[PDB]
Amino acid sequence: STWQTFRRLWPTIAPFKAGLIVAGVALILNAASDTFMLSLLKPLLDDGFGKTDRSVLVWMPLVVIGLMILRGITSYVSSYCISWVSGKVVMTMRRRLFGHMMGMPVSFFDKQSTGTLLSRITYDSEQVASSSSGALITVVREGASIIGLFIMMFYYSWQLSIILIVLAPIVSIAIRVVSNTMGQVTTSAEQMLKGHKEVLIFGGQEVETKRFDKVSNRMRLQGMKMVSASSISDPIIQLIASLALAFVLYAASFPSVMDSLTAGTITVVFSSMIALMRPLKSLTNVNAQFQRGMAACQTLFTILDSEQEKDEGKRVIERATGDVEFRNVTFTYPGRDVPALRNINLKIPAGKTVALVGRSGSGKSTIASLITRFYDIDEGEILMDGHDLREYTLASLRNQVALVSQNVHLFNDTVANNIAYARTEQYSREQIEEAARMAYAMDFINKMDNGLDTVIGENGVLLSGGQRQRIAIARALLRDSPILILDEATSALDTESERAIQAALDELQKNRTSLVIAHRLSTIEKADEIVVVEDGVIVERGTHNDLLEHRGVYAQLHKMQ
Amino acid sequence: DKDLSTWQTFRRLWPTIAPFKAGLIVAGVALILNAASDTFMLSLLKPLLDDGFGKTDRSVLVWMPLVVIGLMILRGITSYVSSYCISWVSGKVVMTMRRRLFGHMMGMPVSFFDKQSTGTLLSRITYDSEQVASSSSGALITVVREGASIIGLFIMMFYYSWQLSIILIVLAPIVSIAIRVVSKRFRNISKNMQNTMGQVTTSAEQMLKGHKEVLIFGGQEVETKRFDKVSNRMRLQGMKMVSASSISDPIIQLIASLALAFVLYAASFPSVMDSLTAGTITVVFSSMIALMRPLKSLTNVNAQFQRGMAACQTLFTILDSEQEKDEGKRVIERATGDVEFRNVTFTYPGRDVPALRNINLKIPAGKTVALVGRSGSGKSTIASLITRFYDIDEGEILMDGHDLREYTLASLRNQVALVSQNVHLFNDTVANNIAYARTEQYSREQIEEAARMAYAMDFINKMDNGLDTVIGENGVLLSGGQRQRIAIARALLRDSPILILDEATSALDTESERAIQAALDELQKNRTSLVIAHRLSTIEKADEIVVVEDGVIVERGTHNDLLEHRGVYAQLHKMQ
Ligand SMILES: *O[C@H]1O[C@H](CO[C@@H]2O[C@H](CO[C@]3(C(=O)O)C[C@@H](O[C@]4(C(=O)O)C[C@@H](O)[C@@H](O)[C@@H]([C@H](O)CO)O4)[C@@H](O[C@H]4O[C@H]([C@@H](O)CO)[C@@H](O)[C@H](O[C@H]5O[C@H]([C@@H](O)CO[C@H]6O[C@H]([C@@H](O)CO)[C@@H](O)[C@H](O)[C@@H]6O)[C@@H](O)[C@H](O[C@H]6O[C@H](CO[C@H]7O[C@H](CO)[C@@H](O)[C@H](O)[C@H]7O)[C@@H](O)[C@H](O[C@H]7O[C@H](CO)[C@@H](O)[C@H](O)[C@H]7O)[C@H]6O)[C@@H]5O)[C@@H]4O)[C@@H]([C@H](O)CO)O3)[C@@H](O*)[C@H](OC(=O)C[C@@H](CCCCCCCCCCC)OC(=O)CCCCCCCCCCCCC)[C@H]2NC(=O)C[C@@H](CCCCCCCCCCC)OC(=O)CCCCCCCCCCC)[C@@H](O)[C@H](OC(=O)C[C@H](O)CCCCCCCCCCC)[C@H]1NC(=O)C[C@H](O)CCCCCCCCCCC
Ligand SMILES: C[C@H](Oc1ccc2ncc(/C=C/C(=O)O)c(C3CC3)c2c1)c1c(Cl)ccc(N)c1Cl
Ligand SMILES: C[C@H](Oc1ccc2ncc(/C=C/C(=O)O)c(C3CC3)c2c1)c1c(Cl)ccc(N)c1Cl
């Protein structure tokens, strides 16, 4: 599979192969430079030390510098080439994953953590390029290094080289033979921090301290274990290699071997045996790093194979000044088969407010999800302006609907652009300031240092749940969407300046198709039609006179609130 | 400047490290020997090429292999030991630091916690407490080991051919400055990428998190366009990161190489080389080549070390932060339970409208008061004050005739029980949640009946392992109606004299709410209670009902009495 993963990847790389092939040449030459420099080491001792002043002056210092210049350039070139390519493919895959994930359905987003998906973008893409680049570099240059070194070794003393060779199998096998709580740490600290208030009033300081003590000590020993394991592996490896060499030098004792040697040649031969010790290390490990790179890549490719939400509606409607009708609708969450909704018909007539109230258990919220077609439905139909929602392309329908809630997520931008999110160009700031004014956001805003152009960004998080909601109104207002989905289930139960919010929302709800998941009494009373939801079905509905005496469970709910 | 800053930081840290001083001692000794091993293997390089090439077969044969192996043994051992002691010392120093931080954050104010998303805290303490040990370990290691070797190597160079050694000295300063200059021009830009990687992170995270809002509002192009820029900038930065090392490294090696070349060139001249041999030329030059690695490490440590002490300092700023104000000195065990507010005014910090202006309510021992009002008044806030999560600004809150602030927070908070729907369910067994921090003090039979008296056993008996079923995992298993009865089960067991009941967030929509109502009746007969009331039941039986708006009590009385008066209370009754 791993090479099958790679060949799927190669297309994204192929456009940049040119950088690879130049990088390859540069790597080869660097190995050549390093081999060539040990070559020089023979003349310095034989020719150089055989009473020749000329050698130690010209050939050595000037060539060594010459070679150093070539060593630097080539390394610079290869680094730049690799970096460039590595940067190019990392960027490309990050952009595909970003676009792909944004297009997925919300079902996709419920499965995985937002941190996991983010981890894919930041880390897993740079890792695959990293590991493959390291793999390629290691192969090419370390490949070149060892054959250049072995040639040279054999050339000046083939006897010793063939000794060393016959020992390589043994050394290879011997080197083979010796070669979670952190989550609990984060968990332990995090769970104390989530339960700080509870900890304070039951006096749970002692038990949490001991709990952390236990976890923190377990990880200390676990973290020690890994360091200790790594520590012993290589001391033996070098010991074993050393043995092989000790034996090689032992061989030099015998006249048959030694007579072909000088001070210069024996020096280079051993020098090149030690030079080998790192290439061989890198080349044994190359396959491992290549594997882990391809494992991350196949993860990415898994995500990229997942289907994005289907948008086959070919109908556009520029504005909906019309009702939404539900026809015998049933909907089930993917993953379980106890339907959140079973047979729902409700008519939000164009321009009037419908508030639906329900128990926490019921899917009052799921209805609101459905109209915006975050999830598609199992049975029945939803028609907006008489056409089924599915007949419309998603952009137009979603443009029709606006959402307002305490938990609408804020982008790190100028408050003004947050209000005119995704339509900064279209809306003149004159409007923006007005919409922020009407939603009674403006008093809180002007306290900011930059005001509207101040950014709630870079994790500043100056705003609070109450303040955000008034921006959500401002956003929905300014855009002037034909339909309102307003969620009050997020409790927001200890507000400071709720009056502002209420007047804002009345303005917003006015003469605007408003569908409301309501927990608040003012919205309830002034809604035109009220609908009760118990589990998956509409139990009853009631208007003004109907409100006074509930056929449904309004009385019991009214007592609660 | 930073020399001083880091060494004040290090002195602060030392007390934590000194109890493991033995580990550091031994590691340093082993490191010296490790460096000595390398020196001695180069010393062998001379007899190999002089006595071994003066037709003495003994040297090469009988003992050149054996001495080498022996030293490589020693080297390996010394290596393992030193690693062992360091890892050992590092582990505990890290662990002890984490314990201190954990213990310190536990005692921090509530406002502090609300403000900072604990991810940063959490992230900081794990990551930064490791990074201070890792950097300080590496700094020590290189100093001792690389310091030992360069001395040993420099001495060796003088013993054989002192002439060459000194040529390298005088060159060493001009080289050092040149190397230092090069290094400072190019490679101190790690943070540069950090800023751009943050932008990458930020844009990815907010699309991932705010995906639904993107879909609704049309953020596709804008959010893609934003990501397009930042990814390119990140990419370019990584190249700059790479490029910095690419340019620095051979230029630096070139510089050192020219010094060496000059030493070599000087060796041609008869004055120095006459005394030299093939043995001692190679040992001297090999040693010069050896030196390059240690010298590189040493210059880089002060950067390495400053990185460690910086992380230490950030931890110390958390340690320096102020804990909960706790000057009471007064402990009371099972306070009778009457709470009086006098002229209490309270504004949440960093807001400019008081949550409560001039509250006076007296709650007699054993009796319940219902705080009911329009949503957004300070009935919820008042609850928070008795536990002294926040101190009032003006006035005083009395518990049994003394200000809460004269009481130890501990004793003060053991008097107060809390019962609400949003109680936290620690990851544990049901038994251990009810007797949350007193598992050693309450018997099973004690726990079993507390749960029974809270009408909770109907949904406990249906669990997998019943009362010892493990609940938690973000409180997933339990529901709001079930949580109240667990919160009640705690209050009953502890039998705290002051109850704070919050039905605001409670769900009256519960198949078993009459059972929650029975548990409440049995919960509050004996003790003083302060109910943020929203249920017909509790307001019916309540002793006093106080109406709050804009943090002001606007009327008081009995239920029947108040409805007779037909003031603010009745209008709330008239609607629902
Ligand atoms: O290159 C260079 O270097 C090198 C070094 O070395 C070695 O080492 C070792 C060790 O080391 C280490 C350690 O420490 O360990 C290692 C490494 O690594 C690794 C690892 O991993 O481990 C390894 C492997 O495995 C591989 O694989 C690798 C790869 O790469 C991978 O991939 O890896 C490293 O480290 C590392 O590690 C780490 C980890 O571990 C973790 O911790 C990592 O991480 C890191 O990394 C980093 O990096 C980066 C940077 O740095 C950059 O880089 C780049 O690149 C790369 C690559 O690829 C490239 O290629 C890449 O990869 C990268 O990427 C980049 O791109 C940075 O940046 C980064 O950062 C990042 O990262 C991270 C990651 O992650 C991580 O994390 C965690 C923690 O932290 C963990 O856990 C994980 O896992 C991980 O992954 C990231 O992450 C980060 O970040 C991120 O993330 C985070 C988160 O957390 C954060 O931060 C954020 O978020 C983000 O950002 C970042 O940061 C990184 O860091 C590290 O680094 C290293 C380092 O680097 C350092 O620095 O280290 C050791 O052991 C060794 O050693 C020693 O010391 C030495 C020796 C001893 C001595 C003694 C001797 C004795 C003798 C005796 C004799 C006898 C007689 C008697 O040793 C050895 O071994 C030895 C022993 C053995 C024994 C044997 C036996 C004996 C017996 C015998 C028998 C006979 C008898 C007779 C070392 N070494 C070696 O190898 C060796 C050598 C030495 C030297 C020499 C000496 C002297 C002596 C003589 C004797 C004679 C005899 C006869 O050698 C040789 O070869 C020799 C030959 C020559 C000789 C001559 C003679 C003459 C005489 C005179 C006469 C006249 C080296 O190696 C090299 O070298 C070689 O190789 C080369 C060639 O070969 C050579 C050539 C030369 C030539 C010359 C001519 C001469 C003649 C002349 C004529 C006249 C080097 N190069 C050199 O060296 C230098 C050159 O050469 C210069 C030249 C100049 C010349 C002058 C002229 C002259 C004039 C004239 C005058 C005369
Ligand atoms: C005879 C001996 O043959 C092997 C064969 C395979 C090896 N495969 C891996 C490794 C190292 C792995 C690691 O370090 O993780 C080594 C050791 C030389 C470094 C190997 C040595 C050998 C060779 Cl051919 C070349 C140079 C030296 N000096 C030695 Cl002894
Ligand atoms: C004369 C010359 O003096 C310095 C002095 C300070 C140095 N300080 C740092 C570095 C490296 C820094 C780095 O790599 O970041 C070097 C280079 C030799 C490696 C230095 C060289 C020198 C010396 Cl005394 C010893 C051995 C060699 N061979 C050389 Cl040239």
Side-chain angles (χ1 to χ4, degrees), chain A residues 1-50 52-53 55-179 181-183 185-189 191-193 195-209 211-213 215-309 311-317 319-320 322-327 329-358 360-378 380-382 384-405 407-411 413-422 424-429 431-432 434-443 445-446 448-449 451-453 455 457 460 463-489 492 497-519 521-523 527-540 542 552 555, chain B residues 1-54 56-123 125-373 375-473 475 477-507 510 512-513 515-535 537-563 567 569-570:
Chain A
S1 71
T2 57
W3 273 94
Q4 252 304 334
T5 309
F6 174 71
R7 252 291 166 155
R8 251 164 79 119
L9 170 62
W10 177 248
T12 311
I13 311 175
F16 313 105
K17 54 169 174 193
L20 293 174
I21 71 181
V22 176
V25 167
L27 292 164
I28 285 174
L29 270 69
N30 184 341
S33 318
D34 287 352
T35 311
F36 197 115
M37 288 179 69
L38 292 171
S39 180
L40 290 188
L41 176 56
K42 160 168 189 281
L44 169 60
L45 293 173
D46 294 352
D47 299 5
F49 215 84
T52 305
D53 294 336
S55 167
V56 169
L57 180 148
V58 167
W59 289 100
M60 289 308 90
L62 306 208
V63 172
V64 169
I65 298 155
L67 285 177
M68 290 302 296
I69 303 196
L70 185 74
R71 203 196 178 261
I73 292 182
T74 60
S75 43
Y76 173 76
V77 164
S78 51
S79 278
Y80 196 101
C81 285
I82 287 288
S83 181
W84 184 77
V85 177
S86 189
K88 296 303 292 186
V89 291
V90 173
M91 183 184 74
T92 300
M93 294 300 292
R94 271 170 181 165
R95 291 167 167 193
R96 293 177 61 189
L97 291 174
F98 183 95
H100 205 69
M101 287 185 213
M102 177 182 70
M104 298 298 294
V106 184
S107 34
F108 171 89
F109 279 80
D110 296 340
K111 308 187 71 162
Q112 319 207 25
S113 306
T114 59
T116 297
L117 305 174
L118 174 54
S119 159
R120 304 267 174 270
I121 276 172
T122 46
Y123 180 97
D124 288 331
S125 298
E126 183 163 3
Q127 193 61 43
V128 59
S130 155
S131 305
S132 305
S133 273
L136 171 148
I137 286 184
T138 290
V139 168
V140 177
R141 180 178 179 277
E142 304 313 64
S145 187
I146 56 176
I147 64 164
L149 284 169
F150 263 132
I151 292 183
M152 182 172 290
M153 287 179 59
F154 272 100
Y155 181 93
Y156 289 146
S157 179
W158 58 268
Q159 296 91 310
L160 293 172
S161 316
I162 197 64
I163 294 175
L164 190 79
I165 292 270
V166 177
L167 290 174
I170 285 66
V171 175
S172 193
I173 301 186
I175 292 171
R176 277 168 164 201
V177 164
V178 292
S179 297
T181 300
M182 166 73 189
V185 159
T186 61
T187 282
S188 181
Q191 290 298 98
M192 176 276 272
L193 295 171
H196 183 238
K197 304 169 205 199
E198 294 78 7
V199 172
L200 286 184
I201 57 166
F202 303 98
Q205 286 91 358
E206 178 180 3
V207 316
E208 292 299 322
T209 300
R211 200 186 270 184
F212 195 65
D213 278 18
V215 179
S216 54
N217 194 34
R218 268 181 57 222
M219 198 199 93
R220 180 176 67 81
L221 301 174
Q222 180 260 44
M224 281 206 65
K225 189 208 72 70
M226 64 172 290
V227 178
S228 168
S230 177
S231 191
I232 185 166
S233 199
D234 207 63
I236 295 168
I237 291 176
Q238 293 176 333
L239 190 64
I240 292 165
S242 298
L243 260 55
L245 292 175
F247 188 80
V248 162
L249 177 61
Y250 174 80
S253 316
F254 300 149
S256 167
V257 169
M258 178 177 70
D259 292 355
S260 313
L261 300 177
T262 60
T265 61
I266 189 167
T267 292
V268 45
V269 170
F270 290 152
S271 295
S272 36
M273 287 173 174
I274 301 209
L276 287 166
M277 273 170 105
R278 187 179 178 79
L280 292 174
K281 174 169 237 201
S282 302
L283 280 154
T284 57
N285 283 1
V286 62
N287 293 117
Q289 69 178 104
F290 196 76
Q291 244 190 1
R292 86 178 63 103
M294 291 307 89
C297 199
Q298 180 68 47
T299 283
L300 274 65
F301 270 133
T302 286
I303 292 177
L304 287 175
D305 287 319
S306 290
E307 227 180 22
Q308 317 191 126
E309 73 177 356
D311 178 16
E312 269 159 289
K314 293 295 191 215
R315 188 180 296 272
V316 186
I317 197 66
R319 188 176 179 80
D323 59 1
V324 185
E325 191 163 336
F326 279 49
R327 286 162 146 207
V329 183
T330 196
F331 168 81
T332 301
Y333 300 135
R336 296 181 178 82
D337 202 66
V338 50
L341 294 174
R342 292 181 65 251
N343 294 282
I344 309 301
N345 307 279
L346 71 85
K347 185 159 179 139
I348 305 162
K352 290 181 180 179
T353 300
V354 172
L356 67 84
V357 178
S360 73
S362 177
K364 57 185 183 297
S365 309
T366 303
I367 290 180
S369 289
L370 288 170
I371 295 178
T372 180
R373 188 173 171 179
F374 291 169
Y375 309 74
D376 273 312
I377 38 163
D378 291 341
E381 296 171 354
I382 311 176
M384 176 203 318
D385 297 17
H387 297 122
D388 187 358
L389 298 192
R390 290 173 289 189
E391 297 185 36
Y392 294 94
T393 194
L394 293 178
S396 34
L397 168 138
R398 271 148 189 197
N399 188 342
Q400 297 300 312
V401 176
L403 192 149
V404 154
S405 162
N407 193 14
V408 180
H409 170 91
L410 276 65
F411 301 88
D413 276 336
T414 68
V415 174
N417 288 336
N418 257 303
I419 290 172
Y421 179 84
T424 59
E425 64 290 351
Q426 182 166 345
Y427 290 148
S428 323
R429 176 177 295 173
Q431 289 181 328
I432 278 184
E434 188 185 24
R437 157 77 155 98
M438 303 190 278
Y440 293 90
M442 195 61 99
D443 280 8
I445 284 177
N446 280 324
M448 293 190 158
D449 289 342
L452 277 200
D453 306 351
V455 312
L463 302 210
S464 156
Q467 313 192 249
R468 304 180 173 182
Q469 178 154 22
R470 278 171 286 173
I471 293 171
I473 306 188
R475 185 180 293 168
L477 277 171
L478 177 63
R479 302 186 43 119
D480 183 358
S481 291
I483 298 170
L484 180 64
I485 298 188
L486 159 51
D487 178 69
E488 291 181 348
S497 205
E498 172 152 317
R499 286 197 302 274
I501 301 183
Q502 290 302 321
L505 291 173
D506 198 7
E507 182 94 22
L508 178 64
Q509 295 178 261
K510 175 180 177 181
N511 189 28
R512 186 179 298 276
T513 304
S514 316
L515 177 66
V516 181
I517 306 164
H519 270 267
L521 292 171
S522 293
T523 63
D528 285 347
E529 190 172 345
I530 301 161
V531 164
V532 188
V533 65
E534 222 200 330
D535 284 7
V537 82
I538 278 181
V539 293
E540 269 310 306
Chain B
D1 183 2
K2 276 224 144 85
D3 177 313
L4 302 179
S5 187
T6 57
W7 275 80
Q8 89 167 335
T9 316
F10 179 84
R11 181 54 59 86
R12 283 209 69 172
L13 182 59
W14 171 257
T16 306
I17 296 171
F20 321 106
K21 190 172 158 67
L24 297 167
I25 291 173
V26 172
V29 167
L31 286 173
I32 287 170
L33 297 182
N34 180 314
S37 284
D38 310 356
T39 306
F40 287 177
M41 289 180 72
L42 271 37
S43 88
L44 295 171
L45 215 60
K46 165 174 93 60
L48 176 78
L49 280 191
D50 286 355
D51 291 347
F53 265 78
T56 301
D57 269 327
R58 157 177 164 270
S59 87
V60 172
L61 191 150
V62 154
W63 64 258
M64 195 59 78
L66 306 190
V67 174
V68 164
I69 296 166
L71 290 177
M72 288 308 288
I73 288 172
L74 180 78
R75 183 179 183 166
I77 290 176
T78 59
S79 171
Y80 168 89
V81 164
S82 71
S83 312
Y84 197 68
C85 299
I86 296 302
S87 179
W88 181 73
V89 180
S90 274
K92 285 190 178 177
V93 165
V94 172
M95 178 181 68
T96 299
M97 275 289 296
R98 294 212 187 101
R99 288 175 169 189
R100 265 231 289 268
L101 300 159
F102 175 93
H104 179 87
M105 278 167 295
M106 180 178 285
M108 295 297 299
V110 169
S111 180
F112 181 78
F113 276 36
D114 290 349
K115 178 197 309 183
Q116 316 179 337
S117 270
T118 57
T120 306
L121 288 167
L122 190 151
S123 56
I125 60 108
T126 50
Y127 174 75
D128 292 337
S129 63
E130 260 163 20
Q131 196 184 227
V132 59
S134 181
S135 285
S136 296
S137 295
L140 173 74
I141 284 176
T142 63
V143 164
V144 183
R145 203 194 50 203
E146 312 298 52
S149 71
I150 64 166
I151 302 182
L153 290 175
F154 263 140
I155 293 169
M156 184 177 279
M157 284 166 36
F158 265 77
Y159 186 78
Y160 324 122
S161 171
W162 55 264
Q163 297 97 319
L164 289 162
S165 310
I166 57 167
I167 309 305
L168 211 66
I169 295 173
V170 314
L171 285 181
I174 67 158
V175 173
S176 299
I177 302 187
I179 295 173
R180 196 170 66 210
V181 162
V182 173
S183 160
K184 290 195 181 159
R185 162 61 161 91
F186 286 109
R187 57 176 185 181
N188 267 308
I189 59 163
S190 62
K191 230 94 176 178
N192 269 69
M193 206 173 42
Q194 170 185 113
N195 286 338
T196 54
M197 181 68 103
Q199 298 185 343
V200 174
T201 297
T202 302
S203 186
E205 213 173 27
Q206 64 174 18
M207 174 277 289
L208 294 156
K209 294 192 308 186
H211 172 209
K212 295 184 198 87
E213 292 80 358
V214 165
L215 298 189
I216 292 183
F217 288 102
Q220 292 85 7
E221 162 60 312
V222 174
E223 282 308 311
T224 320
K225 182 176 179 180
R226 180 160 280 119
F227 193 79
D228 185 286
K229 275 192 337 198
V230 169
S231 61
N232 215 21
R233 309 215 188 268
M234 170 73 207
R235 174 177 86 68
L236 297 170
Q237 292 301 102
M239 284 179 70
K240 302 307 289 193
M241 188 93 211
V242 177
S243 191
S245 280
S246 304
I247 302 187
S248 292
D249 284 348
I251 292 175
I252 292 174
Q253 285 189 328
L254 187 143
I255 288 164
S257 176
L258 269 53
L260 282 181
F262 181 84
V263 173
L264 181 148
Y265 168 90
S268 56
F269 287 136
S271 313
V272 289
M273 175 177 70
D274 281 353
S275 200
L276 265 70
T277 70
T280 183
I281 184 171
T282 55
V283 171
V284 165
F285 278 107
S286 47
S287 305
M288 285 172 188
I289 290 170
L291 281 171
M292 299 191 295
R293 174 176 71 83
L295 297 174
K296 172 169 187 97
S297 305
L298 293 169
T299 58
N300 289 353
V301 166
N302 259 27
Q304 194 175 20
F305 185 85
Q306 291 170 329
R307 192 177 170 198
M309 295 298 92
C312 212
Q313 178 61 258
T314 63
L315 306 177
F316 280 146
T317 64
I318 298 201
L319 274 70
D320 284 345
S321 296
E322 56 157 350
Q323 273 188 14
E324 257 173 356
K325 286 307 246 171
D326 191 26
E327 302 159 39
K329 300 287 152 198
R330 183 187 300 274
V331 311
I332 197 67
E333 177 184 23
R334 193 54 159 69
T336 301
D338 57 62
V339 201
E340 194 196 344
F341 286 50
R342 303 191 197 239
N343 203 59
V344 155
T345 307
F346 179 77
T347 201
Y348 286 111
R351 298 180 180 278
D352 294 314
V353 199
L356 310 161
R357 298 173 296 185
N358 281 318
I359 302 298
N360 309 285
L361 65 78
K362 188 180 202 166
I363 300 168
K367 294 172 126 202
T368 87
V369 298
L371 274 85
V372 64
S375 193
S377 38
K379 58 184 182 298
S380 66
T381 298
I382 290 167
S384 284
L385 291 169
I386 295 172
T387 71
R388 197 175 169 203
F389 292 151
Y390 313 90
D391 282 314
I392 61 181
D393 302 324
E394 306 187 340
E396 47 186 31
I397 306 176
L398 277 63
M399 174 174 301
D400 288 0
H402 303 276
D403 189 3
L404 310 186
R405 300 165 288 190
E406 289 179 352
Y407 286 94
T408 307
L409 297 174
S411 76
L412 173 62
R413 278 152 181 182
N414 298 325
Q415 318 309 313
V416 181
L418 194 140
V419 175
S420 82
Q421 194 147 293
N422 305 135
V423 287
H424 186 214
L425 299 176
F426 299 95
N427 58 342
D428 202 348
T429 66
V430 185
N432 294 344
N433 263 280
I434 281 155
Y436 161 57
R438 312 214 173 289
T439 300
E440 308 277 348
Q441 179 177 345
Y442 290 125
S443 64
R444 184 64 170 201
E445 186 67 24
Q446 265 166 312
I447 292 176
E448 297 183 310
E449 297 307 315
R452 269 178 109 192
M453 286 185 291
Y455 295 84
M457 292 304 291
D458 183 60
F459 72 82
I460 298 182
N461 213 42
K462 291 180 185 180
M463 302 265 169
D464 206 318
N465 289 284
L467 182 60
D468 286 302
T469 313
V470 171
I471 61 178
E473 312 309 338
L477 272 61
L478 258 52
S479 296
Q482 310 183 352
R483 286 153 161 189
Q484 301 184 50
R485 285 173 273 184
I486 301 299
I488 292 168
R490 294 177 180 165
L492 289 174
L493 178 63
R494 305 181 67 96
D495 188 2
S496 294
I498 295 103
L499 165 64
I500 295 169
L501 176 62
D502 186 306
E503 285 162 10
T505 176
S506 292
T510 307
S512 311
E513 186 181 20
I516 303 181
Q517 286 169 2
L520 294 169
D521 296 7
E522 186 65 16
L523 176 62
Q524 60 180 22
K525 289 179 182 178
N526 179 36
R527 64 200 58 133
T528 184
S529 306
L530 183 155
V531 189
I532 298 163
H534 294 81
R535 289 196 195 186
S537 174
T538 37
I539 298 173
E540 178 186 349
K541 182 180 176 181
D543 303 301
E544 324 176 333
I545 296 92
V546 312
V547 186
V548 187
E549 192 198 279
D550 290 349
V552 184
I553 297 170
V554 300
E555 181 67 10
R556 295 190 266 275
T558 323
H559 181 198
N560 295 338
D561 190 70
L562 280 204
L563 264 194
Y569 171 91

